[PDB]
């Protein structure tokens, strides 16, 4: 296909300062930091992600992340070439959407939930245009820049095992398509609508494939109207080509986001509010968010 003319930016270790540790998982460590390029008078808040095999895996992710550019996808700002290479990306100050829905349940209204669905579908449809199959879309892999702006991340599995988020063809035949990402999208929506419930909780992964073959699906979340659950059910159909396209998901959730109380029934949804760029939210003097630092 077309040549990938994306720029791989190499950043000097001296150009950024690590503030604290955000977390540690089954990969390494995520740090919070500040990238202060050369003599540019800017401070960009960043996240820093840190044997030969380990470096191959991380450089494969750098490649995918450097090749995307969308408001609803996390892009690579650059890499740092230390003993083990570090991925430098935009700091998403509110962490992952999964923990966010769990921690802020009492202030999350229908407007926020339906807008997140549109934004996730937008990022996903962009990955589809760029011919990338995510293979790991889940609420844990959606980051929160602000409560009103979310982005898809974790390109470690992205191609040109999370059993409970996979399409039955993926579990059984290792078949991955944009239509199998649509299944993962349905599960992600379910995670949001339940305010972060674990899908098929208590059920071991070995039984999932068989549960799906019989025709069992995730239950209707209490806040979901038949209109919203119908969309989730459509994402979990056996015939992959029967599932909605992401471009249809943008349309469907957009219509709903225009009249959110008609599609999600939440007690107190209206008098609920989350941090906006009015006070608190944000030396703070020369800090510029990566979305405004264009080069
Ligand atoms: C308050 C806060 C902010 C933030 N921001 C952040 C996190 C990123 N995390 C990841 O990119 C990440 C994900 Cl979402 C999955 C697997 C590995 C990584 Cl490094 C990237 C950018 N900003 N992350 C966290 N906790 C991380 C451990 C979750 O990953 N907490």
UniProtKB/Swiss-Prot annotation:
Subunit structure: Binding of the ligand triggers homo- and/or heterodimerization of the receptor triggering its autophosphorylation. Heterodimer with ERBB2. Forms a complex with CCDC88A/GIV (via SH2-like regions) and GNAI3 which leads to enhanced EGFR signaling and triggering of cell migration; binding to CCDC88A requires autophosphorylation of the EGFR C-terminal region, and ligand stimulation is required for recruitment of GNAI3 to the complex. Interacts with ERRFI1; inhibits dimerization of the kinase domain and autophosphorylation. Part of a complex with ERBB2 and either PIK3C2A or PIK3C2B.
Compartment list: Cell membrane; Endoplasmic reticulum membrane; Golgi apparatus membrane; Nucleus membrane
Positions of post-translational Phosphoserine modification: 276, 280
Domain of life from the UniProt record: Eukaryota
Distribution of this protein across tissues and organs: Ubiquitously expressed. Isoform 2 is also expressed in ovarian cancers.
Positions of the Protein kinase domain: 16-264
Glycyl lysine isopeptide (Lys-Gly) (interchain with G-Cter in ubiquitin) cross-link, renumbered residues: 20, 41, 53, 56, 214, 245, 255
Residues bearing PTM Phosphotyrosine: 293
Designated gene of the protein: EGFR
Disease: Lung cancer: A common malignancy affecting tissues of the lung. The most common form of lung cancer is non-small cell lung cancer (NSCLC) that can be divided into 3 major histologic subtypes: squamous cell carcinoma, adenocarcinoma, and large cell lung cancer. NSCLC is often diagnosed at an advanced stage and has a poor prognosis.
Outcome, altering residue 23 to C: Found in a lung cancer sample
Consequence of changing residue 262 to A: Reduced phosphorylation
Result, substituting residue 23 to A: Found in a lung cancer sample
Biological role: Receptor tyrosine kinase binding ligands of the EGF family and activating several signaling cascades to convert extracellular cues into appropriate cellular responses. Known ligands include EGF, TGFA/TGF-alpha, AREG, epigen/EPGN, BTC/betacellulin, epiregulin/EREG and HBEGF/heparin-binding EGF. Ligand binding triggers receptor homo- and/or heterodimerization and autophosphorylation on key cytoplasmic residues. The phosphorylated receptor recruits adapter proteins like GRB2 which in turn activates complex downstream signaling cascades. Isoform 2 may act as an antagonist of EGF action.
Active site positions, chain numbering: 136 (proton acceptor)
Similarity comment: Belongs to the protein kinase superfamily. Tyr protein kinase family. EGF receptor subfamily.
Resulting phenotype, residue 23 to D: Found in a lung cancer sample
Protein name stated in the entry: Epidermal growth factor receptor
Result of altering residue 3 to A: Reduced phosphorylation
Reported modifications of this chain: Phosphorylated on Tyr residues in response to EGF. Dephosphorylation by PTPRJ prevents endocytosis and stabilizes the receptor at the plasma membrane. Dephosphorylated by PTPN1 and PTPN2. Monoubiquitinated and polyubiquitinated upon EGF stimulation; which does not affect tyrosine kinase activity or signaling capacity but may play a role in lysosomal targeting. Polyubiquitin linkage is mainly through 'Lys-63', but linkage through 'Lys-48', 'Lys-11' and 'Lys-29' also occurs. Deubiquitination by OTUD7B prevents degradation. Ubiquitinated by RNF115 and RNF126. Ubiquitinated by ZNRF1 or CBL at different lysines in response to EGF stimulation; leading to recruitment of the ESCRT machinery and subsequent degradation in the lysosomes.
Documented effect of changing residue 13 to A: Found in a lung cancer sample; more sensitive to gefitinib than wild-type
N6-(2-hydroxyisobutyryl)lysine found at: 49
């Amino acid at each position: 296909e077309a040549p990938n003319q994306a720029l791989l930016r190499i950043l000097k270790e001296t150009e950024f300062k690590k503030i604290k540790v955000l977390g540690s998982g089954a990969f390494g460590t995520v740090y919070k930091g500040l990238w202060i390029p050369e003599g540019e008078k800017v401070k960009i808040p960043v996240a820093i992600k840190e044997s030969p095999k380990a470096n191959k895996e991380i450089l494969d992710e750098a490649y995918v992340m450097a090749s995307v550019d969308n408001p609803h996808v996390c892009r690579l700002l650059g890499i740092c070439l230390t003993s083990t290479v570090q991925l430098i990306m935009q700091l998403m100050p509110f962490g992952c959407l999964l923990d966010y829905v769990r921690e802020h349940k009492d202030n999350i209204g229908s407007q926020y939930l339906l807008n997140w669905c549109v934004q996730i579908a937008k990022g996903m449809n962009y990955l589809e245009d760029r011919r990338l199959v995510h293979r790991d879309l889940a609420a844990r892999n959606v980051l929160v820049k602000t409560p009103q702006h979310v982005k898809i991340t974790d390109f470690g599995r992205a191609k040109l095992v999370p059993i409970k988020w996979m399409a039955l063809e993926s579990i059984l035949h290792r078949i991955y398509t944009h239509q199998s990402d649509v299944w993962s999208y349905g599960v992600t929506v379910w995670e949001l609508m339940t305010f972060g419930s674990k899908p098929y909780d208590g059920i071991p992964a070995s039984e999932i494939s068989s549960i799906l073959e019989k025709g069992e699906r995730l239950p209707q979340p209490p806040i979901c109207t038949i209109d919203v659950y119908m969309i989730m059910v459509k994402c979990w159909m056996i015939d992959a080509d029967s599932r909605p396209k992401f471009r249809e998901l943008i349309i469907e959730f957009s219509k709903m986001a225009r009249d959110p109380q008609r599609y999600l029934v939440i007690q107190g949804d209206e008098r609920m509010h989350l941090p906006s760029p009015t006070d608190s939210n944000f030396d703070m003097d020369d800090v510029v968010d990566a979305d405004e630092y264009l080069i």
